[PDB]
RNA sequence: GACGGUGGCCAUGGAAGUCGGUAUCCGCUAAGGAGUGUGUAACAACUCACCUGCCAAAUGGACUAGCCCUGAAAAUGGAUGA
């Protein structure tokens, strides 16, 4: 049935329903490409002020806490149906948490099937191309045009967002080139309050 | 046990029109007409107005239940071939001998000379919906393109099968014309 | 010689899984000889590599 | 214990195996040595200029050369100097054989040698310092007069030295 | 039982075969043991002494032991020809990376001395080998490696072979 | 995602998760084997354990024994009687 097997949820629910009523101001984050190398260097800063707490869609076991708390799992923004989340909890630093949590990011190339964050720029132009790596990009469907003396297609505007998969042939163009345009990491979605929403705005700063 | 009813549903896009008359499905798309019979099934192929096509089977067990998903996916192949037909990409791998490839468009045939330094000319016709052309952009690659998957992939498989090293050790030589990509648009 | 072409060519006639009774190529995620001589036997090894 | 200094111009990042009588039975890699521009007789004494006495033959030690010289540096491992001060003498001829470690207490060296590798080891200090390096070797014990990780959990030494050494 | 113990094994319809094939198995084994030629000593095949043992006109008896029979056929050609009756020694040169799987093949096959391995230069080892086993070891260190490997002579006569006259 | 101490102890040109004898605890978490593998001067790099994201409802295994198939090759042409 439930509550069985290896790595039991009945020893996780002691953290997933009990310490989820002892906090003031929380950060709905994004764990869609975040490492454990980049996570251990942000889970030592939060450890003194709070915790990095998520049951990951075990959290509809929070419906029994909503008797007097009136805590929304679906009534707030980002209705939690298409993504992964690991929400950030704080006791001491409920206020200046948004600055070290958005510093330790690393820019890196993406792969195929990644969750495609809001700031992705395709490597293009003269500096974003070799004359030898054209024959890989010459394999694809789209025909090329000559701009600034190079077999290349230019796309520097944002075309993809969270919820659309990246094609498979686009991954090697980020991996082989040194072009890492965006420094990605944790992404705050909603600033959550104990029964309401504190800030219903996004702030990546 | 044979289940009472086991159906599927095929979604017809708005530019495609199916003309089915007793297990004889005939799509018509913008880019070309395609048809296949399914007279080897006890199946009532049947369309719901304009947008749906419902393969159904009353009292099938297995070897019959297993066939409705097959003949649903084949109609889906016929549909996708007549909206945005399949285009296969085939690449030349050789050790030392550069493979030459000829192509005309009478029967759209391919002719494969200097394969492993063999002097026999590997003239091969394509199945009767298919054309092909060399990739000027990517080196050592010929892209196949067509309207039906059972014609296109079979033409590609005949190119690939007829491009083998015989009487040798196939783990080392690896000279041939293999299917690389299997795109649609 | 591109390594991706060697990977593609090994995908089609080297990366197999040959049955032990039926010396017969199967796909690399097989568990059963597809042929009657084997007895549909579930005894099969990979195709050996080179060095 | 040589002192640790800042990185310099054009640092020759090296990796060595020994520190006692280096290259005794040819116990150093002769390929990590001359790949960087340095002779072999220069390279043998580098293993002892950084640690003369407390090296061991499986190491993540580091030796740096500030416009090439021996600068008395210690960017060394956290594992050599904790099983080195058990049975103290760590030379090359006595690292041909096995050894049973000494059960003489080292809680008060396991805070200075705690972060010898990196500055902040991304580990919770001041309450769990003795449950990472106190149990890092199940061979032998630190002292037989106490049993670790339970009369060593909050029973700790040093509020200012768990990240920074002496 | 008396006929079995106090008798001698007589021979059936296959006597002529189990005697002629026996005396043609005997010359095809005991004569070919350790024999190198004149002129900067090399080994060779069996059929050269199958010529040169009918050429010395050897008559083969079985009741003298096979090791003694080995020491008897080479006495006559030390008397007649200029052939060597001992071991030899080689100095194998192999590169480091692509020769270790050649090392551990012959290391439990034959005896070694002077195992001197580097990183930058070539593994040089010396051998304790019979005179005849060289022609295998000239070819097996190329047909496994796939490149060139060097045969350098060390010494031409060591005892404890058949020179102790067992 | 698959991190640190740590490249665990030992052993040696070199053996760092990944040729071997022995142990197998910790931090941080939802999740880490002192590593299920491929390879290498050893690394690196790819990879599996375990967790998590999309999803929407049944899934997986070890057996049992009915029919059937492999096992199953002989000489004139061929015999459930056809």
Nucleotide nearest to A55 (CA to C1'): F30
Residue with tokens 């504190």: A198
Q: Which chains touch E (3 or more CB pairs under 8 A)?
A: D
Please report, for residues A127, D50, D72, the alpha-carbon distance to residue D38 in angstroms, rounded to integers and kept in the order given.
37, 16, 17
| Per-residue three-class SS string for A45-66 | CHHHHEEECCCCCCHHHHCCCC
Please report, for residues A29, A201, A205, the alpha-carbon distance to residue A103 in angstroms, rounded to integers and kept in the order given.
14, 19, 9
Per DSSP, the three-state class of E18 is helix
Question: Beta partners for B131?
Answer: B145
In angstroms, rounded to a whole number, what is the distance separating the alpha carbons of residues A19 and D146?
A: 35
Domain edges within chain A: 1-107+183-205, 108-182
Asked whether the beta carbons of E66 and E162 are under 8 A apart, the reply is: no
Kindly report each contact of residues B39-45 with a partner whose C-beta sits within 8 Å and lies 24 or more positions away, as own/partner: B41/B67, B41/B68, B41/B71, B43/B67, B43/B68, B43/B71, B45/B20, B45/B71, B45/B75
Asked whether the beta carbons of E59 and E136 are under 8 A apart, the reply is: no
Q: How far is the CA of A41 from the C1' of F37 (A)?
A: 29
Closest residue of D to A45, CA-based? Answer: D122
Chain A: nearest CA to B170, how far in angstroms? 27
Q: What is the DSSP string of B112-178?
A: EESSTT--S-EEEPPPTT-EEEE-SSSSSEEEEE-S-HHHHHHHHHHHHHTS---SS-TTT---EEE
* CB neighbour class for D156 (10 Å; exposed up to 12, middle 13-18, buried from 19): middle
Domain identity same for E61 and E136? no
B residues 106..145 contacting A (CB < 8 A): 135, 137-139, 141
In angstroms, rounded to a whole number, what is the distance separating the alpha carbons of residues D108 and D142?
A: 11
In angstroms, rounded to a whole number, what is the distance separating the alpha carbons of residues A60 and E161?
A: 83
Chain B: nearest CA to A151, how far in angstroms? 10
Mutate to test the interface with C, among B159, B170, B172, B180 (most CBs of C within 10 A): B170
Neighbours of E97 (CB within 10 A): 8
Q: How far is the CA of A114 from the C1' of F24 (A)?
A: 36
Helices (H), chain E: 2-5, 15-26, 47-54, 66-80, 100-106, 134-137, 140-143
Quick check: A139 and B89 CB within 8 A?
yes
Per DSSP, the three-state class of A88 is strand
Closest residue of E to D27, CA-based? Answer: E118
Asked whether the beta carbons of A56 and A85 are under 8 A apart, the reply is: yes
Closest CA to C10 of C32, C31, C25: C25
Domain identity same for E70 and E94? no
Can you give the resolution of this entry in Å?
3.3
In angstroms, rounded to a whole number, what is the distance separating the alpha carbons of residues B27 and B150?
A: 15
In angstroms, rounded to a whole number, what is the distance separating the alpha carbons of residues D14 and A14?
A: 48
E strand or H helix that includes residue A37: helix A37-40
Torsion angle (degrees, nearest 10) of CA E113, E118, E121, E123 = 30
The experimental method is: cryo-EM
Domain identity same for E89 and E37? no
Chain D positions in Cβ-Cβ contact with residue A41 (cut-off 8 Å): 122
Domain that holds residue E65: 11-82
User: CA-based diameter of chain C, in Å?
Assistant: 41
E strand or H helix that includes residue A107: strand A106-107
Which residues are CB-neighbours of A128 under 8 A, at least 6 positions away?
Answer: A152, A177, A179
* CB neighbour class for E87 (10 Å; exposed up to 12, middle 13-18, buried from 19): buried
Quick check: E118 and D29 CB within 8 A?
no
Does any CB of chain E come closer than 8 Å to the CB of residue D25? no
Residue with tokens 């006559």: E76
Neighbours of B175 (CB within 10 A): 21
Q: How far is the CA of D132 from the C1' of F17 (A)?
A: 19
* CB neighbour class for D109 (10 Å; exposed up to 12, middle 13-18, buried from 19): middle
Domain identity same for E37 and E74? yes
Q: Which residues of E131-152 are buried (b: 16+ CB within 10 A; e: fewer)?
A: bbbbeebeeebeeeeeeebeee
Chain A: nearest CA to B137, how far in angstroms? 5
Domain identity same for E73 and E39? yes
| Per-residue three-class SS string for E81-124 | CCCECCEEEEEEEECCHHHHHHHHHHCCCCEEEEEECCCCCCEE
* Domains, chain B: 1-85 (3.90.930.12), 86-185 (3.90.930.12)
Domain identity same for E41 and E77? yes
Domain edges within chain C: 1-51
Residues on D contacting A at a C-beta cutoff of 8 Å: 120, 122-124
Quick check: B172 and C50 CB within 8 A?
yes
Domain C1-51: which CATH number of 3.40.50.300, 4.10.1060.50, 3.40.50.11810, 1.10.3720.10: 4.10.1060.50
Quote the tokens at residue B153: 């992939």
| Per-residue three-class SS string for D1-51 | CCCCCCCCCCCCCECCCCCCCCCCCCCCCCCHHHHCCCCHHHHHHHHHHHC
| Packing angle, helices B65-83 and B149-161, rounded to 10 | 90
Asked whether the beta carbons of D148 and D142 are under 8 A apart, the reply is: yes
Q: What is the DSSP string of C1-51?
A: --HHHHHHHHHHHTS-EEESSS-----TT--S--STTTTS---EEEPP---
Residues D143, D147, D150: CA angle, nearest 5 degrees: 135
Domain identity same for E125 and E161? yes
For chain A, give the number of residues. Answer: 205
Per DSSP, the three-state class of D93 is helix
* CB neighbour class for D71 (10 Å; exposed up to 12, middle 13-18, buried from 19): middle
Domain identity same for E68 and E123? no
């Amino acid at each position: 049935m439930s509550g069985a097997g290896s790595k039991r949820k009945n020893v996780f629910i002691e953290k997933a329903t009990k310490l989820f009523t002892t906090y003031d101001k929380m950060i709905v984050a994004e764990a869609d490409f975040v490492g454990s190398s980049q996570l251990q260097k942000i889970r030592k800063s939060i450890r003194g002020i709070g915790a990095v707490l998520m049951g990951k869609k075990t959290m509809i076991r929070k419906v029994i806490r909503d008797l007097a708390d009136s805590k929304p799992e679906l009534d707030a923004l980002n209705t939690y149906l298409k993504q992964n989340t690991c929400i950030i909890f704080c006791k001491d630093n409920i206020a200046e948490v948004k600055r070290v949590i958005n510093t330790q990011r690393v820019g890196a190339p993406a792969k195929a099937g990644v969750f495609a964050p809001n700031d992705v720029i395709i490597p293009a132009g003269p500096t974003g191309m070799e004359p030898t790596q054209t024959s890989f990009l010459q394999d694809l469907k789209i025909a090329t045009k000559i701009n600034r003396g190079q077999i290349d297609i230019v796309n520097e505007v944002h075309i993809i967002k969270t919820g659309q998969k990246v094609g498979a042939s686009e991954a090697t163009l980020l991996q082989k080139l040194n072009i890492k345009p965006f420094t990605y990491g944790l992404e705050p979605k909603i600033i959550y309050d104990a029964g309401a929403c504190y800030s219903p705005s996004i702030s990546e700063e | 046990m044979k289940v009472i009813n086991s159906s599927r549903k095929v979604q017809i896009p708005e530019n495609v029109t199916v003309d089915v008359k007793g297990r004889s499905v005939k799509v018509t798309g913008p880019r070309g007409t395609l048809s296949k019979s399914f007279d080897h099934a006890s199946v009532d192929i049947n369309l719901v107005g304009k947008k749906e096509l419902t393969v159904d089977l009353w009292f099938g067990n297995r070897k019959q239940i297993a066939c409705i998903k097959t003949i649903t996916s084949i109609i889906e192949n016929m549909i996708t071939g007549v909206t945005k037909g399949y285009e296969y990409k085939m690449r030349f791998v050789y050790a030392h001998f550069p493979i030459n490839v000829a192509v005309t468009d009478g029967g759209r045939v391919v002719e494969i000379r200097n394969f492993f330094g063999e002097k026999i000319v590997r003239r091969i016709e394509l199945l009767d919906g298919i054309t092909c052309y060399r990739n000027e952009k990517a080196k050592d690659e010929i892209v196949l393109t067509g309207n039906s998957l059972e014609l296109l992939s079979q033409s590609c498989a005949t190119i690939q099968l007829r491009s083998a090293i015989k009487y040798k050790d196939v783990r080392k030589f690896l000279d041939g014309i293999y299917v690389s990509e299997r795109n649609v648009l | 010689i591109e390594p991706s072409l060697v990977i593609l060519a090994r995908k089609y006639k080297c990366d197999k899984m040959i049955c032990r009774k039926c010396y017969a190529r199967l796909h690399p995620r097989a568990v059963n000889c597809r042929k009657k001589k084997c007895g549909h036997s579930n005894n099969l090894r990979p195709k050996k590599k080179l060095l | 214990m040589p002192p640790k200094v800042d990185p310099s111009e054009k640092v020759e990042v090296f990796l060595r195996v020994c520190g006692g009588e280096a290259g005794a039975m040819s116990t150093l890699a002769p390929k990590l040595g001359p790949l960087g521009v340095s002779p072999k007789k220069v390279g043998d004494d580098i293993a002892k200029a950084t640690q003369p006495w407390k090296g061991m033959k499986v190491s993540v030690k580091l030796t740096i050369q500030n416009r090439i010289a021996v600068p008395e540096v210690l960017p060394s491992a956290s594992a050599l100097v904790i099983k080195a001060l058990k049975e103290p003498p760590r030379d090359r001829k006595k690292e041909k054989n096995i050894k049973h470690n000494g059960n003489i207490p080292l809680e008060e060296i396991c805070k200075i040698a705690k972060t010898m590798r990196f500055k902040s080891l991304a580990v919770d200090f001041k309450g769990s310092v003795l449950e990472i390096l106190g149990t890092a070797h199940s061979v032998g014990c630190k002292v037989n007069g106490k049993s670790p990780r339970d009369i060593q959990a909050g029973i700790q030494s040093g509020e200012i030295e768990v990240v920074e050494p002496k | 039982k008396q006929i079995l113990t106090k008798g001698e094994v007589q021979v059936s319809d296959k006597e002529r075969h189990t005697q002629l094939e026996q005396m043609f198995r005997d010359i095809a084994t005991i004569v070919a043991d350790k024999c190198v030629n004149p002129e900067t000593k090399r080994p060779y095949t069996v059929i050269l002494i199958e010529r040169a043992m009918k050429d010395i006109h050897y008559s083969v008896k079985t009741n003298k032991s096979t090791k003694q029979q080995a020491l008897e056929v080479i006495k006559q050609l030390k008397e007649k020809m200029k052939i060597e009756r001992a071991h030899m020694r080689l100095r194998f040169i192999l590169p480091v990376n692509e020769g270790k799987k050649l090392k551990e093949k012959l290391k439990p096959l034959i005896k070694v001395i002077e195992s001197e391995d580097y990183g930058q230069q070539l593994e040089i080892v010396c051998l304790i080998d019979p005179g005849c086993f060289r022609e295998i070891d000239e070819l097996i260190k190329k047909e496994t490696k796939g490149k060139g490997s060097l045969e350098v002579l060390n010494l031409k006569d060591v005892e404890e072979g058949d020179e102790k006259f067992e």
